[PDB]
Amino acid sequence: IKPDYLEYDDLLDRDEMFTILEEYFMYRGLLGLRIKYGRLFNEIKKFDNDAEEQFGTIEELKQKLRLNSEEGADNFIDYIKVQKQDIVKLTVYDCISMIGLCACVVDVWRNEKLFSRWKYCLRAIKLFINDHMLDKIKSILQNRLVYVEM
Amino acid sequence: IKPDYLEYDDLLDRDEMFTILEEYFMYRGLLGLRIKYGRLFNEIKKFDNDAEEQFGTIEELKQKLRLNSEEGADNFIDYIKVQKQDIVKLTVYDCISMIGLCACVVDVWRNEKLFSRWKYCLRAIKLFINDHMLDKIKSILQNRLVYVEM
């Protein structure tokens, strides 16, 4: 049995980055941010800052993609595919920003009670972030948590 | 990619009983019951009646097992082991009541904001309900859904 990541403070080598992200989008997407997070989820939360910088404000994105419309989730996936298509040399930081964007998007859906749309965040991550990039994100998070400790 | 089960109205061969129950406990444990459910979850919700008849009221269990205490999840698992011990020969209907019991317990934890405890419902199901029994539960649900169509 894997741990629950909601209040988890570490990122061990045996912890699977994809599972962490699944639990992150589940809890953020269903419960929201008025909940205590552990140090792990609190580090992932910091990715929101990167997202806003790379892709713009969530307000602008909400309007551009009509996120709460019937087509909103499909519009978000299309947007992610456009980014994947267009970024010439994808970096781990593009992927970090994309995780943050998914997180800001899942908030819009939660606030609207479109609870099941959190699943699209996972669909988006699988399209955009390969296993090599997941490993790089994992190592970044491990280093940042060590720095927080020390 | 499997469908989302929150608003799902069917139960097909490809839909796995354990995944359905994972999502049921996740959604009920995190969002609660003031949410639109599909026909599938609405049938599973009927298992609450079986639970109360077989195991007693949630108020009795909450007290007996000190569910919201530090030890509450472990007390719940101990209790599941007790029931399995005391049942002479387990039937599909014992397993149905047990699913309803998990559901009624997850409500108590949601209400207390012990949000990660829903995971213990899955541990309980794995201890109590084998794949043979899950198959039988699936058949029963499928039958009940046909009646709802008619």
Numbering used by the authors:
A (entry chain B), B (entry chain A): 40 to 189
Quote the study that presented this structure, word for word.
A52R is an immediate-early VACV gene encoding a 23-kDa intracellular protein (A52) that contributes to virus virulence. A52ΔN36 had a comparable inhibitory effect to the full-length protein, indicating that the N-terminal 36 residues are not necessary for the inhibitory action of A52. Residues 125–135 of A52, which encompass the 11-residue ‘P13’ peptide sequence that in isolation can inhibit NF-κB activation, form the surface loop between helices 4 and 5. This is distal to the A52 dimerisation interface and is appreciably different in length, amino acid composition and conformation to the comparable loops in the other VACV Bcl-2–like proteins. Residues 92–94 and 117–122 block the groove in A52, the C-terminal ends of helices 2 and 4 being oriented closer to each other than in M11, thereby narrowing the groove significantly, and the side chains of Q93, F94 and Y118 pointing directly into and filling the groove.
Vaccinia virus, the vaccine used to eradicate smallpox, has about 200 genes, and many of these encode proteins that help the virus evade the host's immune defences. This paper concerns the vaccinia virus proteins A52 and B14, which block signalling pathways leading to the activation of the NF-κB transcription factor and thereby diminish the host immune response to infection. The structures of A52 and B14 are entirely α helical, both comprising seven α helices and adopting the Bcl-2–like fold. We show that both proteins are Bcl-2 family members but lack a surface groove for binding BH3 peptides and, consonant with this, are not anti-apoptotic. Instead these proteins have acquired the ability to inhibit signalling pathways that activate NF-κB.
